[PDB]
Amino acid sequence: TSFTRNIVGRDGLCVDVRNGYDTDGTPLQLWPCGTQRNQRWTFDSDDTIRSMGKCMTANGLNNGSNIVIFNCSTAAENAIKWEVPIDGSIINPSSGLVMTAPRAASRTILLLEDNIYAASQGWTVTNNVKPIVASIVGYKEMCLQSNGENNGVWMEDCEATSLQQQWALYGDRTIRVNSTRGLCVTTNGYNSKDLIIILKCQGLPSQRWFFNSDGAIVNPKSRLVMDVRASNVSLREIIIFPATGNPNQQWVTQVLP
């Protein structure tokens, strides 16, 4: 069974076969998302991912290997299989390396690299090529809110008119300030009780998040989850902390009008 989507990643750019060429070996790159065929990827039940009738192919299975388009029947079988872990990676099972956008820029060429759970290794398979804009509702039904670059995020009463409560959920698995999309929700370290702040998006593992089935917002590198510190909204501190299932770690997205 097959279905076709765009693949959105770093900075909301899409996986794109360079210059629309279908020549074997043409690299994959980032490019602003659109409907062109070299950005439409068909996911088949054989774990191939195809554009223009050819396969996404690792041109080698080493750290730093380029990913290219290549004829599905003549490519090495190992090199054309991909899986899509629930946290938003795109992994080549043979090598265990993951598809990575090493720079934010358009025309950055995609590589297989060691998985470090970086936001540069986050992807979203979707027909909607725009970030989803939502409030993030958590403990006491309050809303997560940003408060400027380098400052903490924290909880406030939900307001339809508070733009700092509006989050752009980007395809690279970053959570960005909707009005200032260069800025990312960032853990300031990977240890329990490190503080969650807003920092310039830099593709880092500290800027990657996963909304899991238990209502947690998980930082995959650390394993830890967003937590309203001490269940005390007046502290105005959100930290990462091990998942406990407690109310101060439950979150819902609510789409904004």
Ligand X SMILES: *[C@@H]1O[C@H](CO)[C@@H](O[C@@H]2O[C@H](CO)[C@@H](O)[C@H](O)[C@H]2NC(C)=O)[C@H](O)[C@H]1NC(C)=O
Ligand Y SMILES: *[C@@H]1O[C@H](CO)[C@@H](O[C@@H]2O[C@H](CO)[C@@H](O)[C@H](O)[C@H]2NC(C)=O)[C@H](O[C@@H]2O[C@@H](C)[C@@H](O)[C@@H](O)[C@@H]2O)[C@H]1NC(C)=O
Ligand Z SMILES: *[C@@H]1O[C@H](CO)[C@@H](O)[C@H](O)[C@H]1NC(C)=O
Shortest CB 126 distance to ligand X, Å: 15
Residue 166 contact partner, candidates ligand Y, ligand X, ligand Z, none, CB within 5 to 8 A by sort of partner: ligand X
Residue from the set 52, 61, 84, 133 that interacts with ligand X by CB under 6 A:
133
Q: Which stretch binds ligand Y (CB under 6 A): 12-20, 113-121, 138-146, 147-155?
A: 113-121
Q: How far apart are CA 107 and CA 102, in angstroms?
A: 11
Nearer to ligand Z, 79 or 228 (CB): 228
Q: How far apart are CA 121 and CA 100, in angstroms?
A: 5
15: which residues sit within 8 A by CB, 6+ positions away?
Answer: 6, 7, 8, 9, 28, 29, 30, 39, 41, 56, 99, 110, 123
Residue from the set 84, 109, 116, 256 that interacts with ligand X by CB under 6 A:
256
Nearer to ligand X, 18 or 181 (CB): 181
Residue from the set 232, 244, 246, 254 that interacts with ligand Z by CB under 6 A:
232
Nearer to ligand Y, 165 or 206 (CB): 206
Q: How far apart are CA 186 and CA 222, in angstroms?
A: 12
Decide if 29 contacts 18 (C-beta within 8 A). yes
Residue 189 Cα distances to 23, 155, 207, 231, angstroms: 43, 20, 10, 21
Nearer to ligand Y, 46 or 114 (CB): 114
Residue 232 contact partner, candidates ligand Z, ligand X, ligand Y, none, CB within 5 to 8 A by sort of partner: ligand Z
Would you say the C-alpha torsion 171, 176, 182, 183 has a positive or negative sign? negative
Question: Would you say how long the chain is, in residues?
Answer: 257
3-class SS of residue 197: strand
Per CB under 6 A, does 161 bind ligand Z?
no
Query: Which tokens sit at 234?
Result: 């007046």
Residue 256 contact partner, candidates ligand Z, ligand X, ligand Y, none, CB within 5 to 8 A by sort of partner: ligand X
List residues binding ligand Z (CB under 6 A).
Answer: 232, 234-235
List residues binding ligand Y (CB under 6 A).
Answer: 53-54, 63-64, 71, 73-74, 113-114, 116
List residues binding ligand X (CB under 6 A).
Answer: 130, 133, 166, 178-179, 256
